[PDB]
Amino acid sequence: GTVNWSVEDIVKGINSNNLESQLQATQAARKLLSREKQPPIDNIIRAGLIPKFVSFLGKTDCSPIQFESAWALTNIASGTSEQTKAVVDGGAIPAFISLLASPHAHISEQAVWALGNIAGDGSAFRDLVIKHGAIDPLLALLAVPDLSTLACGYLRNLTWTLSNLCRNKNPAPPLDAVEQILPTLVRLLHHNDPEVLADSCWAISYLTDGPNERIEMVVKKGVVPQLVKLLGATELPIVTPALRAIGNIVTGTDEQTQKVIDAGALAVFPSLLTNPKTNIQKEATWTMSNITAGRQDQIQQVVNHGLVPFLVGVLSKADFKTQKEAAWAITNYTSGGTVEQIVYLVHCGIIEPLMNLLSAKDTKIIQVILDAISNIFQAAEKLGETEKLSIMIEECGGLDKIEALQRHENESVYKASLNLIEKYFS
């Protein structure tokens, strides 16, 4: 019927003064744009069809052509930035927002989808969507006593579009828009649908990826215990954004970090730090590094949860990027910890896997490790057990690595290494 028309045939149908002919040709355009192998998006744009699709959005007396044109425009906006810009240039943003209140849920759902693609292109289009007034009618669609009464795909598309309004930086979304969206986000964060939960965590992920004042906005809503719960989910698409949000939060103040500890997030980290997914261990260890950069009582919580042997583990065997985050976690630990905590660190076996990583080509990790070497010796001087520490390194092949680093580029490596050998290896 309308299967695999030529672009020229679609043009002649849209350019006819027959509404049913225009409807028939618009649907055929939609079918081309929704095909798997290559949608001829650029062919449809070059023929000048976007202004005509946009005009069909306003045909209130002909719902079907509203739907087909909305679907067609949605699929163009899902392409490149240039392609999305073409949809925006045709005036599609106000026309799509006007369709949010359509009595036809499938047309309103399509307008939600289209706005999601437009907002997701970048901060400029995101804020332009916001300026046109999309947030109020979007949130009104979720203003129900129970989210469970909404269609599954409809709620998922609303959640995904909202998360795009929370996404991107330079600039981050407007503060008042974040305040407006955020009570609905929190309600979506407690829904039972896994993908809704995933997109909700991504939205919180985006909102916490900024300065502490953005972070405070989110934590004042009390979402931290829910994020820790989602941190323990089995669905890996939930854990990944949940771990990101938790990691962004522990970049803020020690008080915001403390709320993550108080909510019980540290008990999940034995699993996360042995997680078979490389990125999860990798992200969990970075989060651990920002936790070990906190107060001594928060370092003590790491100790209490048995997490120091787990850091010894990732330092002994992990992906290199993960081992780099483990060194940072150790150096931060050794920088803010007590003598007892730094002593405990060596009793756990941190010295031997720390030496082994003095062989990697990365210049930064050697600086990071050597910083931690110094701090561990620094506590050994308060206990007079320095020489007894020095022999340990000599027996796991260490001094071979340090004294070799005395002849090494970037100087700063050689300075700390020669300084190291000068004081504790006489």
Binding site: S34, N75, S78, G116
Partner: peptide, 7 residues
């Protein structure tokens, strides 16, 4: 960031 509505 974006999604095509397929059939």
């Amino acid at each position: 960031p974006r999604k095509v509505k397929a059939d």
